[PDB]
Amino acid sequence: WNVEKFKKDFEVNISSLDAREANFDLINIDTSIANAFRRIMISEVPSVAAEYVYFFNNTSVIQDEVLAHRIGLVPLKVDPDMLTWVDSNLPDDEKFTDENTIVLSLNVKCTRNPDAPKGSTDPKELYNNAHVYARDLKFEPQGRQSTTFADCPVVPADPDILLAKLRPGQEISLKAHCILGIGGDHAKFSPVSTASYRLLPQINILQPIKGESARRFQKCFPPGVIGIDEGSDEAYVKDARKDTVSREVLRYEEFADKVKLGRVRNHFIFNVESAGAMTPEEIFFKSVRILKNKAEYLKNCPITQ
Amino acid sequence: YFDDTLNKTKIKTYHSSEPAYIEEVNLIGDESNKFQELQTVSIKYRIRRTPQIGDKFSSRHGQKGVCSRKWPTIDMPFSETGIQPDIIINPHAFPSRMTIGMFVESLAGKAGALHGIAQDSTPWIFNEDDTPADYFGEQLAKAGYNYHGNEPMYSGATGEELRADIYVGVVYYQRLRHMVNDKFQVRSTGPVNSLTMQPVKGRKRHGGIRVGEMERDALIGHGTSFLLQ
Amino acid sequence: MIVPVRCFSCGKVVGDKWESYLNLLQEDELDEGTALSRLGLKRYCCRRMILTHVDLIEKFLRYNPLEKR
């Protein structure tokens, strides 16, 4: 074997890409890698998340610590490349900087709207600021951040995330701190919202199938997977990649001998969504990047006796 | 609370070792026509409870188990779909407990969550002629899953596919009481009961552990005799 | 108590869709199935989050110590 024997054979197919999900395919890469190569993207790809939460006041019905992490789970549209890590050894005052940390403030008082068209259920009209939304979090620039983030001010990736509900007289006033962490550290970093793969379902036919069978056969799979060849009436796999591997055929004895269901060997379908912080390929670079950065780091490490 | 007699400002302190929050403070006056200042307060403490290791959970089917480890999500085998399970219950813990309804619920739970429709579990709505297995899997098939509910998955560590499809479903769980934080203790110096100069029950005052005869007997029979004694 | 922010399994952010979900069932009188599918909930992971959900905070909000009846 050799890298060239790989670099020659390895092949990528991008089925689709979106600012949130990008589904692509990786051919001739080897499960030991792709998996590990995957789960770097579920974990160690760092991203910004609120971490330390300072309540000046919570009068809400939601007790603090809940609303604390309930904020923490809120994604942010931020390029973590614009931020730096946070040393824990530093004293708390020094522990945070403008380069370390993004400050988010939240201030809401709930007041009864006197305009309520009495005989109204709707709390939106009954009350003022009854519902607290992600979009309500205010970004407070610090130092250079005032400059830096003028381009793309910090925003919760899903502005309409419902944080808290409030009744008149109740208020919430807080400041939270956003830092870099890896999903491996805590479940709220890695901006996947999921990441995974699967194998091309190598489905193959052991002997021609036609007549009603092909139709019955074709029905046993997701549509469009099984083409029925016209004029031979026989069934042919159109594309397996659409298959969900229900193994439904295996329930029908007639077809049970006629088809084997399998996965191809080295090939992968990556479905990578995102929390919205980064486009998947942007992440997927860091997936590669980090893994490489492990070795290149470790190669340079002296091996102590 | 300031004391007049001792002319001191004294203090009540938080006894429990587990850090709590101040939830509510209730100023309680008294009857008999006022003139009485505040002599009593009740205080809610809020205590965070998370699913620590050692916390009994259960299904509705009577499967009780201790959380063994919070399991790193990347290591939790992940679906063909990309869904890592929330909970992983050993498949061996069945034939002995003879709980089928959990398998059935595992189907229906999934079956519902797909079609978005609630699934009546009322007993004796089925029969040997119409089984739920036949019933729900039929739905799963129409949903495009394995009629048996089994699913292709991949070992989260290796990444390779597991030997066979494994059986996944959506089951309603119940976190119990009896969290480990409530139950354990160690090394009780403090109490040293006055009569016997011996420790005392652990509870929350710093006791110890009773030995007892059946435990004594073992030492003798166990073998660790010098040690035992 | 209140809408979970993320799907436990998926990790996908489910916290916002609730209001719109009720809106769908309410205004559009959809089924439970389509609305979820229309909200873009594919994995039955993230479907159960909204689907099974209870807003029980609503009952809590009915008790407000900070206001007259």
Binding site: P223 | - | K42, Y44
Partner: peptide, 24 residues
């Protein structure tokens, strides 16, 4: 006895990664 009523109008909710309902 009346058997458990089959829930009518159940389409495919599940689709392989990177596909929609319409594709099928």
């Amino acid at each position: 006895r009346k058997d458990v009523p089959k829930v009518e109008g159940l389409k495919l909710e599940h689709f392989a990664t990177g596909y929609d309902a319409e594709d099928f």
